[PDB]
């Protein structure tokens, strides 16, 4: 139980160059162990909304960071199916009463990661959720998606097949990727580099956002970057040249749709 | 052996509210355990073609529909590869007659859930198929590819990497996803909701089709919805609005192919 | 220990319609494993680069195929996880002195077949890397990423999630995929069919090249195929039909950057 925790963590973190998995200390252990363990329960959470802003707290990802340092890498697994890495995965050794208290299912061959938290009433496919991510209640990720290191996944969404969200760990000061409650994200999406897509948002398959992703808003005919805003039905499109050679690819937002809408009309009917 | 398994599961799925793991009688369990079986063994489809026409059998996904409500979610596996789930995976128990029987190869870490039918000669790189769907002869599904929930997938059928075939168990009266013999979808598409994929067809990569994509036909300038014709070419393409400010992605017919052409062109020669 | 390994090989290839995994010499199984054991361990490539032009090895792609000939499908794994195939997996047996002394890490549920070379410092996030390939030092696999039979991965490259890297065993004489040192494969795009992605060069997310795909330079206004110029930055755009009814997707450059730029920019202020 350290005096002050995050002290502890960011002390540690300057002194980074002198740990390893042999010299480390108890205390220093303990407290990346701890917030680790916080993590995973969904005690702490990398990003939270506060003020209606998404705040970032850089010393829990520099502990995620001190808990690759301070360990090893390890043998697991057994048969065809070895490997070699030095964190461990979220469910091992949970038997029926761990996994029943979780509320959770796990389909094979699903992993995560401890230290990712994944809520009541959610369903993983075959997909990975790796270190740091926070998965809220009744939200399906579905088969061979993945929630990248710290991106944090609102109640109620879906992550179609193929979804990748992209992880953000370094830089620390950078707010990971945000899906708010109720998003739809089609099939085969990217959302990466802390982009934001507010509650109630509709991507179609095969949108991809980065930072540098123009999101051209037809009704408006402006462009706009890295958010979606909320109840934003998202489409693949482009944008033509000044001369007409050629397009490049964007997303466009072709509607905006209020929660009643969303509750009344199918994701196959919103299009 | 129920007198009339169809009428015993449409009985059961009214008396769903009723059912669970523990309550369920004898009677309802075995005829959603026979249907299941049938499923797995292909003696049963979910979907098939009468007259020239896909026909769907909603008694059938009720039974699917059904076994979930029936089972309690289990520990599975061992290991760094801990699982909680209720829908058995295919292959638990088998041994060495049991897949020389099947006549397929299961590449590792593919998985296939009970209730899946695989036909001789499939390869299941690592990828997913999940319940109810069939899997035809000689057909090809390859790595992280996914075949969703009740699709159907014609014989020497070639998915490419990444390739997902969407799922399609609710609503019970809507078709599943289609995909017909000797098709070639290539690495990264997807096709959902329904969609059918008519035989000797080819899709590029990175081709998304679901029930609102717009087909657009280069060769009479006309636009369709949710069928490829029969020996298509299709390519991802766009579509400029009226005032030319932008596009939105669409797929494209680029040109049609008879059998003939198919047996001798290679899929990379015909483009 | 052959008298001459490559005649070996290519007189059993002439031969293979005869071999089988009961009637195959002790002579023929040796040479195939032996090519095998050294495409493992990176001393064997099945294309290197020689005199700036990469040249293919078409007698190791025939050991690669004979090494399938030869083999019976056996069952893998256990428990929820039971597979049958005929390609060993390459850490079968491995404790941590082999893993150690590999220098490579490898994230559950990751898997490569025998015969893929994995060089130090990669890490294999849940992944997939067939046989033939070379993944050399540095390289991150990122989740759900695949790299092909026989493909050729550079130094320090960065294959994001869902890349894939198409394999090329047949044709005998075609080159497989490559991606050269340094370069950035942005989430979900596909390289396939022998595409040469060359030096220091930046694909963007939702990029597709295969030997078909345009490649449209923006500042010449010129098409091309089949190769990335080194230090490109490429991202998904379309070229209009002449009668601008709609266009077709492409790959287009958008600039072009040394290697003093790449060490001084990150990639997500390449854009
Ligand atoms: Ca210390
Ligand atoms: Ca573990
Ligand atoms: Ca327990
Ligand atoms: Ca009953
Ligand atoms: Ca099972
Ligand atoms: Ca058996
Ligand atoms: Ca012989
Ligand atoms: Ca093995
Ligand atoms: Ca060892
Ligand atoms: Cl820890
Ligand atoms: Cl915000
Ligand atoms: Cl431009
Ligand atoms: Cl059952
Ligand atoms: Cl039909
Ligand atoms: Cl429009
Ligand atoms: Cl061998
Ligand atoms: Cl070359
Ligand atoms: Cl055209």
Redesign the interface.
Same mark, same amino acid.
């Given at each position: 139980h350290t005096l002050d925790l995050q002290t502890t963590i960011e002390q540690a973190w300057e002194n980074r160059a002198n740990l390893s998995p042999v010299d480390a200390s108890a205390e220093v252990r303990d407290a990346v162990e701890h917030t680790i363990d916080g993590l995973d329960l969904g005690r702490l959470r990398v990003a939270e909304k506060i003020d209606d802003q998404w705040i970032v707290h850089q010393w829990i990802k520099k502990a995620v960071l001190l808990s690759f340092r301070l360990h090893d890498? !390890?043998?697991? &697994?057994?048969?065809? %199916?070895? *490997?070699?890495?030095?964190?461990?995965?979220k *469910?091992? &050794?949970? #038997? /029926?009463a761990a *996994?029943?208290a979780g509320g959770?299912?796990?389909?094979?061959? !699903?992993?995560a990661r401890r230290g990712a938290f994944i809520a009541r009433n959610v369903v993983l496919?075959?997909s990975?959720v790796?270190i740091g991510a926070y998965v809220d209640e009744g939200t399906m990720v579905d088969?061979?998606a993945?929630v #990248?290191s710290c991106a944090q996944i609102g109640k109620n969404v879906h992550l179609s #097949?193929?979804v &990748?969200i992209?992880g953000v760990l370094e830089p620390l000061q950078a707010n990971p990727t945000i899906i708010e409650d109720n998003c739809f994200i089609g !099939?085969?999406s990217?959302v990466? /580099?802390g982009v934001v897509v507010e509650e109630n948002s509709v991507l179609?398959?095969?949108v991809?956002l +980065?930072? +540098?992703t123009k999101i051209?808003d037809?009704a408006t #005919?402006k462009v706009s970057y890295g958010r979606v805003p909320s109840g934003s039905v998202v489409?693949? &499109? =482009?944008?033509? +040249?000044e001369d007409? =050679?050629? =397009? %490049?690819?964007?997303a466009?937002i072709?509607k905006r749709v209020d929660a009643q809408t969303r509750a009344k009309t199918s994701i196959?009917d919103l %299009?």
């Open positions: 890498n !390890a043998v697991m &697994g057994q048969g065809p %199916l070895q *490997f070699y890495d030095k964190v461990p995965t *469910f091992a &050794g949970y #038997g /029926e *996994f029943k959770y299912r796990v389909v094979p061959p !699903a992993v496919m075959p990975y790796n088969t061979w993945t #990248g #097949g193929g &990748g992209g !099939a085969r990217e990466v /580099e179609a398959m095969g991809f +980065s930072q +540098s051209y037809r #005919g489409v693949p &499109g =482009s944008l033509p +040249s007409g =050679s050629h =397009s %490049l690819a964007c466009v072709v196959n %299009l």
